[PDB]
Amino acid sequence: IVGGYTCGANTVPYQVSLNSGYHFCGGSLINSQWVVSAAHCYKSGIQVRLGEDNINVVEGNEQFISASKSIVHPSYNSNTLNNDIMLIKLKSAASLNSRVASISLPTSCASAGTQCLISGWGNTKSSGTSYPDVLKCLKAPILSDSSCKSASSAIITSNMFCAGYLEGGKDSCQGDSGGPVVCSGKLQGIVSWGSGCAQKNKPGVYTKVCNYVSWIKQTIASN
Ligand SMILES: [Ca+2]
């Protein structure tokens, strides 16, 4: 997250960190046994870390659980990043509490102008690299479709939406991928991609979760 602020320990109870000897992506807990993240974050040997704040020190409240299976969307395209969504089933059910809670799936899509909260342990600099120890937060509005399509270099599909600031300075970034975009208490987006980070006229692009609710439910129910 670039230009964001320190969230505060466990204030984002649904935030997850995907780990393979190091933090490589974020995710969102949607129920005691399932996490939603980005398909481009797929990898074998994933350990899910819940209740995290400082990802480099054990502070208490953390729950480390191995992934028993990762389900990348069948129509995911690595070239365009269309359908950049993945479901991870935990080997064991997480112990839900005040610091580890699930986030609700949307019943309808969010409209332009809606304010949302994006979070993660990704790069905090537009130029160069600097990874934080603690979870970062950023409030950003969903942009209109016309502005989204006019500013994006690559193709923006109906399964994506833009969020952020056209003036630059505030955006999600490398390492935040797979993370949550929550608006009105519902998970509306997944950090997917962008052109650089916090650049002028280059807002972040996210996976539009409201288009995958049925798929999420059907997949979880049959696994
Ligand atoms: Ca920790």
UniProtKB/Swiss-Prot annotation:
Processing and modification events after translation: Subsequent cleavage after Lys-125 leads to alpha-trypsin. Further cleavage after Lys-170 yields pseudotrypsin. A cleavage may also occur after Arg-99.
Residues annotated as domain Peptidase S1: 1-221
An example Gene Ontology molecular-function term: metal ion binding
Chain sites annotated for binding substrate: 171-172, 174-175, 177
Cofactor (UniProt): Ca(2+)
Keywords: Calcium, Digestion, Disulfide bond, Hydrolase, Metal-binding, Protease, Secreted, Serine protease, Signal, Zymogen
EC numbers: 3.4.21.4
Enzyme class label: hydrolase
Residue positions of the active site: 40, 84, 177
Main location (coarse class): secreted
InterPro entries xrefs: Peptidase_S1_PA, Peptidase_S1_PA_chymotrypsin, Peptidase_S1A, Serine_Proteases_S1, Trypsin_dom, TRYPSIN_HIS, TRYPSIN_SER
SUPFAM superfamilies the UniProt entry points to: Trypsin-like serine proteases
CC cofactor note: Binds 1 Ca(2+) ion per subunit.
GO terms under biological process: digestion; proteolysis
GO cellular component, one term: extracellular space
Tissue: Synthesized in the acinar cells of the pancreas.
A family per Pfam: Trypsin
Disulphide bridges, residue numbers: 7-137, 25-41, 109-210, 116-183, 148-162, 173-197
Catalytic activity: Preferential cleavage: Arg-|-Xaa, Lys-|-Xaa
Cellular localization per UniProt: Secreted, Extracellular space
Subunit structure: Interacts with SERPINA1.
Protein name (database record): Serine protease 1
Taxonomic placement: Eukaryota, Metazoa, Chordata, Craniata, Vertebrata
Gene: PRSS1
